[PDB]
Amino acid sequence: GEAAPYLRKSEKERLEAQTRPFDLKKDVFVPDDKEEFVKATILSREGGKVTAETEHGKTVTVKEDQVLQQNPPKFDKIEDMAMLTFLHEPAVLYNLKERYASWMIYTYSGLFCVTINPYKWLPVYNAEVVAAYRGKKRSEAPPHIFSISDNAYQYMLTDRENQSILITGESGAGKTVNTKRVIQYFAVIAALEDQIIQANPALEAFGNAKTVRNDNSSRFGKFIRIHFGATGKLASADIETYLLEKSRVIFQLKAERDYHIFYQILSNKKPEDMLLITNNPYDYAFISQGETTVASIDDAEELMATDNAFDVLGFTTEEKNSMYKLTGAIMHFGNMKFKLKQREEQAEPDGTEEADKSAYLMGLNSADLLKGLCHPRVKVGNEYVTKGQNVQQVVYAKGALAKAVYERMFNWMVTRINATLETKQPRQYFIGVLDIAGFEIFDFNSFEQLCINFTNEKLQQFFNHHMFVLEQEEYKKEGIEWEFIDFGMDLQACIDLIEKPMGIMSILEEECMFPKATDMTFKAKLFDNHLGKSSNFQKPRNPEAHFSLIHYAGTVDYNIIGWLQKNKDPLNETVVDLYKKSSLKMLSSLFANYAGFFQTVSALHRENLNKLMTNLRSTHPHFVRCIIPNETKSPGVIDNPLVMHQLRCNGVLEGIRICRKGFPNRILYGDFIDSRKGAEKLLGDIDHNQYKFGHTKVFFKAGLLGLLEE
Ligand SMILES: Nc1ncnc2c1ncn2[C@@H]1O[C@H](COP(=O)(O)OP(=O)(O)O)[C@@H](O)[C@H]1O
Numbered sequence: 001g002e003a004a005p006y007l008r009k010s011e012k013e014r015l016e017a018q019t020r021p022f023d024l025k026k027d028v029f030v031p032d033d034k035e036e037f038v039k040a041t042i043l044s045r046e047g048g049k050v051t052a053e054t055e056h057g058k059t060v061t062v063k064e065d066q067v068l069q070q071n072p073p074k075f076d077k078i079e080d081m082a083m084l085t086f087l088h089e090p091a092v093l094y095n096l097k098e099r100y101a102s103w104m105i106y107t108y109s110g111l112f113c114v115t116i117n118p119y120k121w122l123p124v125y126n127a128e129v130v131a132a133y134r135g136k137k138r139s140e141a142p143p144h145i146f147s148i149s150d151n152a153y154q155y156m157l158t159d160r161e162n163q164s165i166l167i168t169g170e171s172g173a174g175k176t177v178n179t180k181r182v183i184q185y186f187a188v189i190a191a192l193e194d195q196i197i198q199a200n201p202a203l204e205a206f207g208n209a210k211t212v213r214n215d216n217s218s219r220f221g222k223f224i225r226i227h228f229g230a231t232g233k234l235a236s237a238d239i240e241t242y243l244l245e246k247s248r249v250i251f252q253l254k255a256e257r258d259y260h261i262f263y264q265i266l267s268n269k270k271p272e273d274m275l276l277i278t279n280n281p282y283d284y285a286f287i288s289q290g291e292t293t294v295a296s297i298d299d300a301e302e303l304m305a306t307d308n309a310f311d312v313l314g315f316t317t318e319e320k321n322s323m324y325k326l327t328g329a330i331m332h333f334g335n336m337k338f339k340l341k342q343r344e345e346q347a348e349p350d351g352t353e354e355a356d357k358s359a360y361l362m363g364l365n366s367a368d369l370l371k372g373l374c375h376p377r378v379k380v381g382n383e384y385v386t387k388g389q390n391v392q393q394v395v396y397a398k399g400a401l402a403k404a405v406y407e408r409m410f411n412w413m414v415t416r417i418n419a420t421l422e423t424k425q426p427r428q429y430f431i432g433v434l435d436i437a438g439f440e441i442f443d444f445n446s447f448e449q450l451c452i453n454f455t456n457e458k459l460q461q462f463f464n465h466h467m468f469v470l471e472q473e474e475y476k477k478e479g480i481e482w483e484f485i486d487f488g489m490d491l492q493a494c495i496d497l498i499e500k501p502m503g504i505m506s507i508l509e510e511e512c513m514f515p516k517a518t519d520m521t522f523k524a525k526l527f528d529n530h531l532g533k534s535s536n537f538q539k540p541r542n543p544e545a546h547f548s549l550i551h552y553a554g555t556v557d558y559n560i561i562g563w564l565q566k567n568k569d570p571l572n573e574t575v576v577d578l579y580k581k582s583s584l585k586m587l588s589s590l591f592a593n594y595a596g597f598f599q600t601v602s603a604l605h606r607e608n609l610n611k612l613m614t615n616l617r618s619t620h621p622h623f624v625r626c627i628i629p630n631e632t633k634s635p636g637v638i639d640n641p642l643v644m645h646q647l648r649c650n651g652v653l654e655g656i657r658i659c660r661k662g663f664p665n666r667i668l669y670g671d672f673i674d675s676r677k678g679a680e681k682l683l684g685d686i687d688h689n690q691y692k693f694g695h696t697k698v699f700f701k702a703g704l705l706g707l708l709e710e
């Protein structure tokens with residue numbers, strides 16, 4: 001057989017009808033003062049178009065020049081949108097809807113792939129499918145992330161250059177689950193190295209958690225590069241982490257959860273007591289707020305999934321019991337007294353079981369830590385002063401240790417993981433796979449949310465910078481003297497407002513170095529600098545005292561609390577000095593090592609990202625746009641304003657234009673005197689018209705080289 005008999009591949013891609021209602025019936029998509037349209041039979045035409053509608057009445061002349069019509073049902077449910085005769089928001093949504101209701105999540109849009117989250121597990125990712133997709137053309141194979149990932153792999157071999165697959169989506173849009181299959185494809189294409197497959201579910205327990213927008217929400221940016229040699233066999237794999245929401249460990253909002261790991265460990269009877277663990281909620285204060293479990297997910301069976309990944313990847317039984325002794329101690333640090341010696345402002349713990357956290361966490365003196373937290377030694381100039389803190393500052397310092405201990409342990413995981421995957425025989429060509437923490441909007445948005453929205457903005461900029469601006473620069477002289485066409489999409493203004501002089505980051509860094517500086521001080525400084533000046537900055541009126549920032553994906557209001565403390569994440573030297581001199585070997589490396597763990601958090605993320613974007617530019621990009629159908633995390637429901645504006649901000653429609661208007665195919669006088677003339681040498685039975693050049697020939701349309709190969 002092949003991909004032609006009606007079984008599994010043909011079953012899960014399109015379906016035939018038996019009634020053909022076609023004829024000369026022409027239609028138009030019409031709304032009702034909102035972005036929600038219905039079909040309408042066109043009744044009359046001259047200067048405008050009289051449309052019947054019949055849905056709640058009839059005739060309405062007002063169509064004219066705007067109009068924007070319905071495409072023949074012949075196109076309805078097509079695979080590539082650059083094929084549609086009429087192109088606009090309703091015409092595009094309907095084709096994506098027609099496919100979705102037939103459980104076809106993938107659709108092509110000019111070049112870049114489009115994926116609408118199903119919120120149900122579709123059987124389209126099988127070994128039988130990976131094999132059915134091995135080395136097959138875009139025209140030869142229907143839309144699928146296995147085709148896009150194959151095309152990238154083929155291009156890194158045919159063009160001999162680095163490739164990068166870039167996935168673009170909001171929180172819960174399918175980025176992680178797509179990234180998961182791109183790596184799943186290559187291990188059973190070019191490749192033991194099963195571990196590459198096991199690295200992601202090991203960074204899922206410690207790295208992913210439950211938000212109101214996603215149950216397995218990636219609380220970190222991930223750059224996974226799959227290494228290849230000369231022939232194209234799997235040489236290695238390198239992973240990089242980004243803005244980890246380490247504040248989630250000490251605090252979670254209503255209905256949310258902490259990292260999966262905490263819930264998984266309490267569920268497993270490994271000490272069967274030694275770690276002094278008990279029940280998931282109640283007892284542990286860093287967990288007992290909102291919820292304990294996620295629907296249709298087993299916290300007992302998930303630690304069986306991660307212990308499997310640790311033992312596969314080379315983590316020994318002692319290393320495991322070390323990592324869990326940390327997790328069990330973060331939970332143990334979570335229950336402190338911090339009462340009062342003198343009822344004014346002197347903190348004092350009235351005998352607690354912190355001698356048990358001190359037991360699990362590398363046998364640190366129980367008499368110490370108590371002193372290292374309550375009374376930590378500072379210095380005024382050259383004088384070693386002893387500070388006697390208050391209940392609030394003791395809580396924040398306790399938290400400082402929890403967040404520090406955790407992030408540093410998570411960063412160690414990646415170092416230990418890469419000292420398995422990356423370490424083999426690396427060099428040559430490679431496939432980069434981006435899985436960034438998607439565009440977030442909540443009731444309370446703090447520092448980490450701004451960090452996220454900056455990453456999402458700059459990644460979206462890279463899509464605008466590559467689809468248009470870069471393409472149009474090449475068209476300048478060589479093309480049809482290129483008009484040129486102008487697209488309203490420009491996210492540099494909102495970027496400049498966040499970073500470069502003058503920007504939010506710079507204004508914030510200046511306040512960390514400043515001693516008198518407080519939260520109330522620098523929100524005033526922000527307003528002083530950006531209100532009534534920048535149009536993409538907004539100062540809430542008499543809402544609150546926070547600040548609003550306009551993005552491609554919409555405006556966000558960010559609350560200022562912590563922020564200065566978040567940016568200059570401080571851990572008292574006494575608590576650092578306390579942990580270096582400890583029993584357990586694992587946390588000894590978490591404080592004694594310097595090569596791996598002053599620089600302000602915002603400047604580090606700014607530069608981590610700078611570094612990331614500079615890698616990508618030296619790579620050939622492949623875009624995947626993840627569209628979320630709804631906000632109730634439910635299958636079968638595709639909402640009109642939710643989807644119709646993800647495409648509006650993603651620049652999906654304009655990305656079909658220039659792919660249609662301009663010249664997507666560029667070449668010289670090779671790969672075909674033997675070859676020099678674009679008109680003369682190619683004139684020898686069909687076409688001979690849709691192209692253009694001046695010098696450094698030729699610039700052809702997408703619908704010419706597709707037939708030249710076929
Ligand atoms: N292609 C897909 N097939 C099946 N389920 C999917 C798919 N994409 C996403 N999901 C579901 O939606 C959830 C949210 O997607 P996810 O990849 O975790 O988010 P994000 O895009 O933010 O990284 C997943 O936990 C999974 O249940």
Ligand SMILES: [Mg+2]
Pocket residue numbers: 175176217218435436437438
């Ligand atoms: Mg994710």
